[PDB]
Ligand binder design. Structure first.
Ligand SMILES: COc1ccc(NC(=O)N2CCN(C(=O)c3ccc(C)o3)CC2)cc1
Length: 121
């Protein structure tokens, strides 16, 4: 498909699947700072899936690359905050990341192909 706009609904459908995953529950809303009082001593830029969905729905992503950078920050934040590579929440993040990467690969490829077709002449 050479549709330059198709990534947006493809990303909405993938966020729907991520919200149905039990593994997403820790990442649906901002990290609770009363629960984890040192969180902002370790994490400079908090990110969560509700924030990513709102950003997309506001029309404040220009490309699926930008959405992909914010989703990858959800996962790098969990790796940076975990006290162990065996923690429950970190382990959930690694399964959810594998799922996300499996699904976003075609979204990115199709978008970049569409942009190349737009500039072909
Ligand atoms: C109000 O409802 C909420 C329910 C759950 C959450 N999630 C959190 O508080 N988080 C804890 C720290 N995070 C980690 O990635 C993490 C790696 C290791 C360990 C122990 O935590 C992110 C997720 C936020 C709001």
């Amino acid at each position: 498909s050479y549709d330059i706009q198709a990534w947006k609904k493809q990303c909405e459908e993938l966020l729907n699947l991520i919200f149905q995953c039990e593994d997403s529950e820790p990442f649906r809303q901002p990290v609770d700072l009363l629960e984890y009082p040192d969180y902002r001593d370790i994490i400079d830029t908090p990110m969560d899936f509700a924030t990513v969905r709102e950003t997309l729905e506001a029309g404040n992503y220009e490309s699926p690359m930008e959405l992909c950078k914010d989703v990858r920050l959800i996962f790098s934040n969990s790796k940076a905050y975990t006290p162990s590579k065996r923690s429950r929440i970190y382990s959930m993040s690694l399964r959810l990341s594998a799922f996300f990467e499996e699904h976003i690969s075609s979204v990115l490829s199709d978008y970049k192909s569409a942009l190349r077709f737009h500039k072909r002449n």
